[PDB]
Design a protein around this ligand. Structure first.
Ligand SMILES: CCCCCCCCO[C@@H]1O[C@H](CO)[C@@H](O)[C@H](O)[C@H]1O
Ligand SMILES: CCCCCCCCO[C@@H]1O[C@H](CO)[C@@H](O)[C@H](O)[C@H]1O
Ligand SMILES: CCCCCCCCO[C@@H]1O[C@H](CO)[C@@H](O)[C@H](O)[C@H]1O
Ligand SMILES: CCCCCCCCO[C@@H]1O[C@H](CO)[C@@H](O)[C@H](O)[C@H]1O
Ligand SMILES: CCCCCCCCO[C@@H]1O[C@H](CO)[C@@H](O)[C@H](O)[C@H]1O
Ligand code: NA
Ligand code: NA
Length: 505
């Protein structure tokens, strides 16, 4: 089996797994529309009671499976619990990352396309003022790029440039993945993560210098870091905070598990996993939190910045921030640096999100790495046309896989590993080879607190929020639901074929 060459490479690959579009696009929007500091108390609590313990669990399951030649949850779940239902539940550890890849890589390709256009100066001219005179040309810029519908049809018409840039983006992902773990993902992470840190630090510094009649960057830091215990009893904030923790740490994606399956059997995962987790949180709250929100608050004030964050998921990062930069000297180049930052953040995460299907094809169907990567890329590339051309298909997949799926799968993998497999054997397996030991209090968190916390959360989710999405949606969401259900059936069939290969073997 392939293995990570160096410990630093391991940590930077896992940190690039986690540090992605979630840190720089998702976190600012979720924090802003949930009260800023009101969001941070649940967020910190979720990191300590959900994020960290699940990170260790996924590292442990991955390393455990990899020692036996399996890096994905169909096989690993069965190793933990020899029951055919374990294999079926394990399909989610391929389905979730595949579905997320199908829209994540497309969004990643937007950042490359914008980076190219901002570098070359093919960007809107804001007229020398009225805020909508500033925002409108950049709103139109994004809408023409992805082809937002202008009539009543729920159809997207992305520009030719956007489509070609998606092909290029897929080619870049393949170019890394096809070289494998140590020579591909690991080598690239050692280049991309330092670049990523430097770009973000420079952007934070430039943003902190922003000052207008409406405020300063410091006003945004105060909005984000001022506790607000009013919302502390609002269910929606807790669901938001825990969803962000899952998404940003790549938990419930099967992707931490697959990366860890290339960790040598006796190599530490306690300190490694903790470091990857803490690195992501620093990049999230310090770097991600210090760019978009402080810039928007400085130029528009808090109330308008909040309204902007509530406008959409891409309004802050693809419209508002480039519009703000356009009002500064060298602002188009600053836009390029922002979108190049997002591209590298996305690329290091999308190679991680596609490696689970690659590992399954290699491990269970015994494909060569080349064939496993190309077939995975073909599946993602083909399926992405749904996200490219059907309005709000992106949203539906991000919901079932990227939002509900990861939380459900996180609870599932914990129950399998810490209840069925055995809490004491799971605890033994986590700490084996540890450079440090997991704090003892965390045994009771993982066995009792984390599962109760996630179960309560999933209950209120399905009772007080899901019915709206099941009855209050446009009919075209059934196209996307139909297709991703088909994907689950196709993957279940591949698990079936992998079973019968190992029986005829
Ligand atoms: C083989 C993939 C199955 C679906 C066929 C997709 C064909 C893509 O079609 C292309 O989309 C671009 C972006 O809007 C347009 O610029 C081009 O006019 C169009 O040819
Ligand atoms: C970004 C690296 C090169 C790939 C992008 C080049 C493909 C852009 O293609 C261009 O799109 C526009 C469509 O009207 C027009 O400029 C031209 O028809 C076409 O050459
Ligand atoms: C299945 C994925 C969406 C396919 C729509 C992309 C093409 C949109 O553009 C279409 O290109 C077609 C040929 O490529 C032509 O038949 C259409 O007349 C033309 O409008
Ligand atoms: C995977 C594709 C999801 C659905 C996207 C359909 C894009 C439709 O695209 C266009 O629609 C026109 C009607 O307005 C038709 O004349 C053309 O067939 C087609 O080019
Ligand atoms: C959700 C629980 C948050 C965990 C906070 C970190 C706990 C570290 O706390 C330490 O735990 C060690 C147990 O091994 C003990 O040796 C120490 O007495 C204690 O200080
Ligand atoms: Na992240
Ligand atoms: Na990343």
């Amino acid at each position: 089996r392939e293995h990570w060459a160096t410990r630093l490479g391991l940590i930077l690959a896992m940190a690039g797994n986690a540090v992605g579009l979630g840190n720089f696009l998702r976190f600012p929007v979720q924090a802003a529309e949930n009260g800023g500091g009101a969001f941070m108390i649940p967020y910190i609590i979720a990191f300590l009671l959900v994020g960290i313990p699940l990170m260790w669990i996924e590292w442990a399951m991955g390393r455990y499976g990899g020692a036996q030649g399996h890096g994905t949850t169909p096989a690993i779940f069965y190793l933990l619990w020899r029951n055919r239902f374990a294999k079926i539940l394990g399909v989610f550890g391929l389905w979730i990352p595949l579905v997320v890849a199908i829209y994540y890589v497309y969004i990643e390709s937007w950042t490359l396309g914008f980076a190219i256009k901002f570098l070359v100066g093919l960007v809107p001219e804001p007229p020398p003022t009225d805020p909508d005179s500033i925002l409108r040309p950049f709103k139109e810029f994004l809408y023409s790029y992805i082809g937002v519908p202008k009539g009543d049809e729920p159809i997207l018409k992305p520009s030719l440039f956007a489509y070609i840039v998606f092909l290029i983006t897929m080619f870049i992902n393949v170019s890394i993945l096809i070289r494998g773990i140590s020579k591909g993902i690991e080598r690239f992470a050692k280049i991309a993560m330092p670049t990523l840190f430097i770009l973000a630090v420079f952007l934070v510094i430039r943003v902190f210098l922003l000052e207008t009649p409406n405020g300063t960057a410091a006003d945004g830091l105060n909005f984000l870091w001022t506790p607000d215990f009013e919302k502390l009893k609002d269910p929606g904030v807790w669901i938001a905070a825990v969803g962000q923790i899952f998404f940003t740490l790549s938990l419930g994606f099967g992707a931490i598990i697959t990366y860890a399956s290339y960790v040598r059997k006796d190599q530490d995962i306690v300190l490694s996993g903790l470091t990857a987790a803490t690195l992501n949180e620093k990049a999230e709250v310090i770097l991600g939190g210090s760019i978009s929100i402080p810039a928007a608050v400085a130029f528009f004030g808090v109330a308008n910045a909040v309204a902007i964050a509530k406008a959409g998921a891409f309004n802050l990062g693809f419209i508002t921030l480039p519009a703000i930069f356009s009002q500064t000297a060298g602002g188009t180049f600053l836009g390029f640096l922002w979108f190049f930052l997002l591209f590298f953040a996305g690329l290091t995460s999308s190679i991680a999100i596609m490696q689970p299907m690659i590992a399954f094809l290699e491990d269970e169907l015994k494909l060569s790495a080349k064939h496993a990567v190309l077939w995975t890329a073909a599946i993602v590339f083909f399926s992405a046309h749904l996200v490219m051309f059907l309005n709000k298909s992106l949203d539906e997949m991000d919901f079932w896989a990227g939002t509900i799926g990861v939380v459900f799968f996180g609870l599932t993998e914990l129950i399998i590993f810490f209840w069925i497999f055995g809490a004491d054997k799971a605890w033994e397996e986590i700490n084996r080879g540890g450079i440090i030991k997991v704090p003892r209090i965390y045994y009771y968190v993982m066995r009792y607190i984390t599962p109760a916390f996630l179960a309560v959360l999933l209950v209120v989710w399905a009772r007080e929020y899901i019915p709206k999405i099941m009855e209050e949606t446009h009919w075209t969401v059934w196209i996307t639901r139909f297709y991703i259900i088909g994907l689950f059936l196709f993957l279940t069939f591949l698990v079936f074929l992998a079973e019968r290969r190992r029986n005829h073997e």
